[PDB]
Amino acid sequence: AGAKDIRSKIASVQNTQKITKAMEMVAASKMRKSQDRMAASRPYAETMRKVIGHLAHGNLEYKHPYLEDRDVKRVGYLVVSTDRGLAGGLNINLFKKLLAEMKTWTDKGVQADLAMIGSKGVSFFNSVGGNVVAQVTGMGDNPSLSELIGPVKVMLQAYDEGRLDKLYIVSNKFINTMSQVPTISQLLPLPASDDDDLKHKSWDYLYEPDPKALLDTLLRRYVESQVYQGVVENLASEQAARMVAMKAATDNGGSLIKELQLVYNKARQASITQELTEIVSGAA
Amino acid sequence: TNVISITDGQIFLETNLFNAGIRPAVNPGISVSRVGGAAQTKIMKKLSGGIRTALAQYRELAAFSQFASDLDDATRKQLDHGQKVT
Amino acid sequence: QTGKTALAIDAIINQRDSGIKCIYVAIGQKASTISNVVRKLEEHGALANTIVVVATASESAALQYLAPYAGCAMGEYFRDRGEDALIIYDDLSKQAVAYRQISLLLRRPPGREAFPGDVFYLHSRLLERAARVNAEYVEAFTKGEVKGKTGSLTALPIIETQAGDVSAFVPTNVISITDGQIFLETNLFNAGIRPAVNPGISVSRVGGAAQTKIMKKLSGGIRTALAQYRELAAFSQFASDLDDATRKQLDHGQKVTELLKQKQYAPMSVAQQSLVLFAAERGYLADVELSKIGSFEAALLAYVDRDHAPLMQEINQTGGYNDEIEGKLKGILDSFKATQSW
Amino acid sequence: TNVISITDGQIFLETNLFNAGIRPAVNPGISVSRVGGAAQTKIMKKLSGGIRTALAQYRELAAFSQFASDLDDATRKQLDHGQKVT
Amino acid sequence: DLDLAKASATDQLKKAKAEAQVIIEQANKRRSQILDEAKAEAEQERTKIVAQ
Amino acid sequence: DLDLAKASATDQLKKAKAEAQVIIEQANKRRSQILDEAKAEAEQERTKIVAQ
Amino acid sequence: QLDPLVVGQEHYDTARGVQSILQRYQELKDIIAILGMDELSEEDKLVVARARKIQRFLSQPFFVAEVFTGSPGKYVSLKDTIRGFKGIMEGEYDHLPEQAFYMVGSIEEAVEKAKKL
Amino acid sequence: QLDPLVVGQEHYDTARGVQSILQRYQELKDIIAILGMDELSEEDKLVVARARKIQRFLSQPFFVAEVFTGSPGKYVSLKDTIRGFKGIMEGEYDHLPEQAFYMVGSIEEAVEKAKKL
Ligand SMILES: Nc1ncnc2c1ncn2[C@@H]1O[C@H](COP(=O)(O)OP(=O)(O)OP(=O)(O)O)[C@@H](O)[C@H]1O
Ligand SMILES: [Mg+2]
């Protein structure tokens, strides 16, 4: 206490408020750039999914393991997590949703396997004893598809090897600048999602060399691309959450200054009084 | 604070700028002349009319700078100009 | 209530066999506490070695104010005859209050916080009686009866600070008079760290010159371990984000700090402190888990006391240090860390 | 404090509440009546119960339950009644 | 069989370790027994030699 | 490799068994010494108190 | 009187554990105040969640305070409270809401109060 | 008295250079803590190495502290102080390990001490 301590604390908290306001600005710009990069992904996935429309669930059928709803003995999850803190509750809400559903699954006796994107989930599930089979980390704010090839490759190789029976991606969904929602959504076996080619019965392709060889790589690339889309949306959601969290923290600091300055003024006055009564009642 | 209440302005000399090598370390924003341009020769009243607040803003913009690479060049022009004049 | 009295009375108990006579002079304490600490000095062997001077809170101000001089005059009987003594003024911050009362009743002009002017010169000429006198002054004083021995009187005044504030009148004087400070912190005392000595602001101008050279060797590394820990500590609340190259330091700091905790009325011989610091300095604790450090320490101190007693005897008796001693210690740690358990 | 120490309670009127149109701005939680219900008519005592601790709890609950909330239906009815009461 | 030896050895060491850890607890308690016996027989003696 | 591995397999029982023996043979001396030293203290304390 | 040699090891150790938790909780209130509860480490969230229970369980209803609160007073024996605090600290009542502990007698009135909300 | 007109430009520039190096190393400590060393640039790792070597070289053994440490004291002329710090900042002695500079005295004693380490 004493004026010269409380003024030092007020100074340090004002500095903290500078820091958090700068971080809010930075995050608010990075969110825009990240959602531009989020809308530069739709064409590839959408056209490729239209293609898989015609080739697979067309009037013509084909015998791919990744379109048939075989039996569930164990399930895989691709987990997207930030590489950086200060994100608000994002990661933990997501991990709690995941843990609740993975509990519901293991209550039928099925095992589960995790592939981790981002280091925060890596640490969390190393602590909670999850079954992490592969991971990639340090992508930061520059996610790239080439880095994702590893873990999704592992999960696919395990799926077609029979070792998995269903595959999920768990990630945040950027909806509004002010609201993002965690979602667990399936990507193997491929969902049934309209895209009817009954209209396109007018034509069929020249397949070089054959449709099955293509359909294989089509589906593999498509899964890779949906994982990438998920990573990029989660990145934009992280930026939005950091923006709102730093906003809240700047207003908290701004109120703590109001408290500290009342304490400071009280100490200022008490010190003046006690100095002056010590002088005056000294004389005589 | 007695004397600040008696006089017609103050030139606030800032230790941080002085140690950093900005000599004379005049601190804009917090320093002020209350007679204003009435005391300033015409040419200087013309040429200097912007400097004060432009610098007052640059000094906080360049304080935002350090926590942000990848600056919008609409602001990088400003952070260059302020540094020129400083 | 941070252990100021406990620290001094363990300092007194530990001299029960060291040749140093001890004097414990109590200013302004309530009698049923003096009786309690005397009952504890009697439990352990220390009472037969020490003098107690009492000025209970009910005694007039003149006695409370003169008691420290009456104690110093009883330590000087030993100093001036070639022996060693230790004197512990409990609460000079109550001698100062009694002297303030006496001054204000004599109508002397008051100073700051109403303390009289010469309250520096009050403590200055008390503490500067704590001295070591060379053998020639002894021979001159004892008129030739004692030769070649140097007397010594050691003082450990105690002060009490309101709300940790060290910028008040009496604290700021006695901090200026003395040779060092042991700052006891109430936060460290709550968090479990006992004794609560704050290493970052405690000092001792005598320093290593007063240690046994084994301790002088080994503690230098503890200073730096704790200094690096105190520079890094700010990140502990973001620790998960840190880099292992610093996480190593930030955990070694916590382990050495958990090592310096100690129970009351349990003093250690120099052999045991040296051994236990060597254990942490040479990385043996790098893998023991934080919550077990104390049981590790206890087991080690027990093991060595039966299976290597002659080395303890040597160290305690001479305090020396050699590559030979270092090899023996490394051997003891190696055998312990494998062939026993905590 | 000298007078809080002499009387048999206090009615603490808080300015934050008063600015929010809550008038009279009786802050429950600080205000108390050291004679308690012994003074009330039996009907009033029956109806009121420990209501003031109910509103103290509601008002501190609103301290965490603005930016987020948990147990979010029973806390929801707690908040609903506290709000309609106030 | 390498790891038969390995594992059985590790757990066999741990059992020796626990057996020591419980050989110690009886020791601590017996101390408390005999030392409080000495305390009782000390007070009960003092408080009658002095009365005499 | 059969000889080289089965050597360790046949030896580590002997070795780790001897060390599990050793741990306990220390702990036993610990118990015995404590039951001795509690006797030493039993005499020392009572003698102190009678002198008092 | 709070010495192992007077109150016995278990009581002393429980008291010091409670103090350690509450102090560690004080050391976090500034970061919690500024940045909110979400920036804490996953083990600090547990320290906070246990301290906020210990604080309530230190509450008690008094026989002479029925005037103020209606609730009937309670008398808690020592043996019956060091057990409750040892429990909360050891995390075996770590599945019960905070308001389950507020204004109760022994730890068994808390486990009951939880059932009724 | 620390301005070019009185100390000479050589001295003034060497002093301001030491200040610049250390003032940058202060910036970099808190990157190294969060990210570890390896994420720095080439010149950032090099600024760090020279900053640590300068920070070491400012230590010295005293003829009067000779009684606390046993090590004999050293007297360093101003010519040699400037020559040493300028040599370190230019990168002439980048090939010595840090501890060659601690408590070394003159700069030649650094190139000598580096042998025995
Ligand atoms: N090393 C320790 N470990 C555990 N407890 C301790 C330790 N040292 C002291 N204490 C406890 O701290 C409490 C306060 O001790 P003590 O009275 O010595 O402090 P103090 O500063 O003298 O307080 P006061 O200023 O009121 O005399 C004592 O009950 C003691 O049991
Ligand atoms: Mg005391």
Which DSSP helix (H) or strand (E) runs through C24?
strand C21-27
Distance CA C184, CA C200 (A): 11
Distance CA F6, CA A7 (A): 75
Of G30, G18, G9, G6, nearest in space to G90 by CA: G18
Which DSSP helix (H) or strand (E) runs through B73?
helix B73-85
Distance CA C306, CA C340 (A): 13
Is residue C263 lining ligand 1, measured as CB closer than 6 Å?
yes
Strand blocks (E) in A120-228: 132-136, 166-176, 179-188
Helices and strands in chain A: count of H runs, count of E runs: 6, 5
Structure token pair of residue C195: 């004794």
User: In chain C, which ranges are continuous DSSP H helix?
Assistant: 4-13, 31-43, 61-79, 92-105, 120-127, 135-141, 169-177, 186-191, 213-232, 244-259, 270-281, 293-307, 309-318, 323-339
Q: Are residues A26 and A70 in the same domain?
A: no
Structure token pair of residue A43: 């064409």
Distance CA C50, CA C44 (A): 12
Structure token pair of residue G108: 């068994």
E26 Cβ under 8 Å from any chain F Cβ: yes
Amino acid at A99: L
CA distance C341 to chain E (A): 7
Q: Residue A198 class from Cβ within 10 Å (0-12 exposed, 13-18 middle, 19+ buried)?
A: exposed
Distance CA G111, CA C65 (A): 58
The domain total for chain A is: 2
Which atom of ligand 1 sits closest to the CA of residue C261? 1
Helix G44-57 and helix G78-90, axial crossing angle in degrees, nearest 10: 160
Structure token pair of residue E6: 């390995």
Contact flag C109-A278 (C-beta cutoff 8 Å): no
Beta strands at A74-80 and A166-176: parallel, antiparallel or unpaired:
parallel
On chain B, the residues whose CB falls within 8 A of the CB of A18 are 63
Rg (CA), chain C: 23
- Within 10 A of C36 (CB to CB), how many other CB atoms are there? 11
Beta strands at B32-33 and B9-10: parallel, antiparallel or unpaired:
antiparallel
Torsion over CA: A214, A219, A225, A229 (sign)? positive
Q: A57 with A192: CB under 8 angstroms?
A: yes
- The catalytic residue among C112, C194, C205, C230 is C205
Entry resolution (Å): 3.3
Q: Are residues A243 and A165 in the same domain?
A: no
Distance CA G71, CA G74 (A): 9
Domain limits for position A192: 60-205
Q: A219 with A160: CB under 8 angstroms?
A: no
Ligand with the closest atom to the CA of C159: 1
Distance CA A54, CA A205 (A): 9
- What chain E residue is nearest to F5 in terms of C-alpha separation? E2
Which chains have at least 3 CB atom pairs separated by less than 8 Å from chain E? C, F
On chain C, the residues whose CB falls within 8 A of the CB of G28 are 237
Sheet holding A74-80, edge to edge: A132-136, A111-117, A74-80, A166-176, A179-188
Of F10, B31, B2, nearest in space to E8 by CA: F10
**CATH code, domain carrying A124:** 3.40.1380.10
Distance CA F5, CA A135 (A): 36
Catalytic, B34? Answer: yes
Distance CA C6, CA C10 (A): 6
Contact flag F27-E20 (C-beta cutoff 8 Å): yes
Is residue C262 lining ligand 1, measured as CB closer than 6 Å?
yes
Q: Residue H38 class from Cβ within 10 Å (0-12 exposed, 13-18 middle, 19+ buried)?
A: exposed
Of B67, B76, C242, nearest in space to A30 by CA: B67
Distance CA A211, CA A56 (A): 9
Distance CA C169, CA C96 (A): 10
> CA A170 → CA A10, A76, A192, C141, D22, distances in Å?
43, 10, 19, 89, 46
Q: Are residues A47 and A73 in the same domain?
A: no
Of D62, D6, D53, nearest in space to D30 by CA: D53
Domain limits for position G94: 2-117
Ligand with the closest atom to the CA of C29: 2
CA G8 to chain centre: 21
CA B52, B53, B54: angle at the middle one, nearest 5? 95
G20 Cβ under 8 Å from any chain C Cβ: yes
Q: C122 with C96: CB under 8 angstroms?
A: yes
Residue C52, SS3 per DSSP: strand
Distance CA H86, CA H66 (A): 28
Q: A169 with A187: CB under 8 angstroms?
A: yes
Give the dihedral of Cα atoms C66, C67, C71, C72; nearest 10 deg.
-30
**How many alpha carbons fall within 13 Å on the CB side of residue A134?**
15
G41 Cβ under 8 Å from any chain A Cβ: no
Cβ within 8 Å of residue D78, ≥6 positions away: D57, D58, D61
The label of the residue with tokens 């969060």 reads H34
Residue A133, SS3 per DSSP: strand
The domain total for chain G is: 1
Domain residue ranges in chain C? 1-211, 212-342
Beta bridge partners of D26: D13
- Ligand 1, from C2, C89, C182: best to mutate by most atoms within 8 Å of Cβ? C2
DSSP, residue by residue, C101-163:
HHHHHTTPPB-GGG-BGGGHHHHHHHHTT--EE-HHHHHHHTTTSS-S--EEEEE------GG
CA distance H5 to chain C (A): 39
The label of the residue with tokens 């700047």 reads A250
Q: F20 with E13: CB under 8 angstroms?
A: yes
Structure token pair of residue G65: 């305070």
Ligand with the closest atom to the CA of C195: 1
On chain C, the residues whose CB falls within 8 A of the CB of A84 are 241
3-state secondary structure string across A65-120: HHHCCCCCCEEEEEEECCCCCCCCCHHHHHHHHHHHHHHHHHCCCCEEEEEEECHH
Structure token pair of residue A249: 């923290």
Cβ within 8 Å of residue A181, ≥6 positions away: A172, A173, A175
Beta bridge partners of C152: C84, C132
Amino acid at A228: Y
Distance CA A86, CA C138 (A): 69
Residue F51, SS3 per DSSP: helix
Interface probe for A, chosen from G29, G38, G44, G45 (most Cβ of A below 10 Å), is: G38
Helix C213-232 and helix C270-281, axial crossing angle in degrees, nearest 10: 50
* Long-range Cβ contacts of D47-54 (<8 Å, 24+ apart): D49/G70, D50/G69, D50/G70, D50/G71, D51/D85, D52/D28, D53/D28, D53/G69, D54/D82, D54/D85
Q: A2 with A271: CB under 8 angstroms?
A: yes
Q: C198 with C188: CB under 8 angstroms?
A: yes
Distance CA C162, CA C166 (A): 8
Distance CA A233, CA A37 (A): 9
Distance CA C44, CA C48 (A): 10
Torsion over CA: C214, C220, C222, C225 (sign)? negative
Contact flag H33-C243 (C-beta cutoff 8 Å): yes
Beta strands at D9-10 and C203-204: parallel, antiparallel or unpaired:
unpaired
Amino acid at H3: D
DSSP secondary structure letter of residue G73:
P
Residue B26, SS3 per DSSP: strand
Domain boundary among the residues A186, A205, A224 is at A205
Interface probe for C, chosen from G13, G27, G29, G48 (most Cβ of C below 10 Å), is: G27
Neighbours of ion ligand 2 (CB under 5 A): C 5
Distance between Cα C193 and ligand 2 center (Å): 19
Beta strands at A179-188 and A166-176: parallel, antiparallel or unpaired:
antiparallel
Distance between Cα C63 and ligand 1 center (Å): 26
Q: Are residues A184 and A70 in the same domain?
A: yes
G73: left (phi over 0), alpha (psi -120 to 50) or beta: beta
Domain C1-211 class in CATH: alpha beta
> Which CATH architecture best describes the domain C212-342?
Up-down Bundle (1.20)
Q: Are residues A283 and A212 in the same domain?
A: yes
Contact flag C241-A85 (C-beta cutoff 8 Å): yes
3-state secondary structure string across D5-53: CCCCEECCECHHHHHCCCCCCECECCEEECCHHHHCCHHHHHHHCCHHH
Atom 19 (ligand 1): residue with closest C-alpha?
C3
CA distance C266 to chain A (A): 36
**How many alpha carbons fall within 13 Å on the CB side of residue A144?**
5
Which atom of ligand 1 sits closest to the CA of residue C29? 27
Ligand with the closest atom to the CA of C1: 1
DSSP secondary structure letter of residue C44:
S
Distance between Cα C276 and ligand 2 center (Å): 30
CA distance C192 to chain G (A): 6
Structure token pair of residue E39: 């305390």
Domain boundary among the residues A173, A205, A237 is at A205
CA C325, C327, C331: angle at the middle one, nearest 5? 115
Q: H38 with H48: CB under 8 angstroms?
A: no
**CATH code, domain carrying H30:** 1.10.1140.10
- What chain C residue is nearest to F29 in terms of C-alpha separation? C306
G63 Cβ under 8 Å from any chain D Cβ: no
Q: C300 with C275: CB under 8 angstroms?
A: yes
- Within 10 A of A53 (CB to CB), how many other CB atoms are there? 16
Distance CA B81, CA B54 (A): 9
Distance CA F3, CA G3 (A): 63
Atom 23 (ligand 1): residue with closest C-alpha?
C1
Q: Are residues A93 and A187 in the same domain?
A: yes
Distance CA H21, CA H47 (A): 7
Distance between Cα C7 and ligand 1 center (Å): 8
Among F23, F30, F33, the residue with its CB nearest the CB of C339 is F23
Cis peptide leading into A189, omega within 30 of 0? yes
Q: A156 with A189: CB under 8 angstroms?
A: no
Q: A76 with A112: CB under 8 angstroms?
A: yes
